[PDB]
Design a binder for these strands. Structure first.
Lengths: 82, 62, 45, 48, 48
RNA sequence: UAACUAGGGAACCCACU
């Protein structure tokens, strides 16, 4: 199933954004390079919110279809919820 | 008779039972609160499966 | 046990009893670290 | 002053967390455990 | 009596607020409905 | 020249919600 057969919803759900911010801010707190030009923060969770609004989180969500298949959506491909 | 100094307690990785390695019961033995079945159901309803893993596995008895 | 049954553990209670991460939303999916987009980010000082 | 959050030392917060460890435990905003890179716990309530 | 730009804004708003109301894949619907039925169970009374 | 951890259970009763 290529990008033609890409059948899940284009909107990033609340669960996907809730886990993406968590595991991105956990990486930022473990001294990952930050993708965005931060204006000065110490909270990694606020920096991950900056990267989520910048659509620059380097994470692909593997959405498991219930038959066994899986799609791979980029965060920048997903329309953010808010 | 119900005073708030008699009822306040917190807990963080204190004494642990010997039969299973879960925290103690009651504030007199520095025990922790019970994260019962209905809270497990409520955190299923939130969909906080990482918080539910953190409660039921990591911050209780890893 | 008498019938030799198995448990595929796709449910919620099975993963909670075994203490691993449930497939319940924040957990229904999996996350892949992107290879190309990590080139595009700068190292913080 | 009895429930703790495990905050990871990064260069953004290393001065703040350094000051909270210098306060030690019971100088309220400080800390009680400091966990090494190999998972070794160091108390701050017993004044090393 | 809407105007043309008001009507374009209206269609965009209807399309947005419908796409926000789609059920999210991953939502624990079962526990949600069981709580949605058992929480009015305590408020109901045979003798009221 | 600072020796650094904790230990039980089972029943009943009462109280809080």
């Amino acid at each position: 199933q290529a990008n033609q057969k890409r059948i899940t919803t284009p909107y990033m759900t609340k669960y996907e954004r809730a886990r993406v911010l968590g595991t991105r801010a956990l990486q930022i707190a473990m001294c990952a390079p930050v993708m965005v030009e931060l204006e000065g923060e110490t909270d990694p969770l606020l920096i991950a919110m900056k990267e989520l609004k910048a659509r620059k989180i380097p994470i692909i969500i593997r959405r498991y279809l219930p038959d066994g298949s899986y799609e791979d959506w980029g965060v920048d491909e997903l329309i953010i919820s808010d | 008779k119900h005073m708030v100094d008699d009822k306040i307690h917190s807990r963080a990785r204190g004494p642990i039972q010997i039969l299973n390695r879960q925290p103690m019961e009651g504030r007199s033995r520095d025990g922790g609160l019970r994260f019962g079945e209905m809270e497990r159901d409520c955190q299923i309803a939130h969909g906080a499966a990482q918080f539910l893993r953190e409660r039921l596995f990591e911050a209780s008895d890893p | 046990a008498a019938h030799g049954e198995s448990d595929p553990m796709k449910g919620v209670s099975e993963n909670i009893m075994l203490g691993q991460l449930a497939p319940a939303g924040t957990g229904c999916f999996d996350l892949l670290l992107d290879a190309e987009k990590c080139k595009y980010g700068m190292e913080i000082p | 002053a009895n429930m703790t959050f495990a905050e990871i030392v990064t260069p953004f917060n290393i001065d703040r967390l350094q000051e909270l460890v210098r306060r030690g435990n019971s100088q309220y905003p400080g800390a009680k455990y400091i966990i090494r890179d190999n998972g070794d716990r160091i108390d701050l309530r017993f004044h090393p | 009596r809407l105007s043309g730009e008001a009507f374009d804004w209206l269609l965009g708003e209807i399309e947005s607020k419908f796409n926000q109301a789609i059920a999210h894949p991953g939502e624990m619907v079962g526990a949600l409905a069981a709580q949605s039925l058992g929480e009015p169970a305590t408020q109901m009374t045979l003798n009221t």
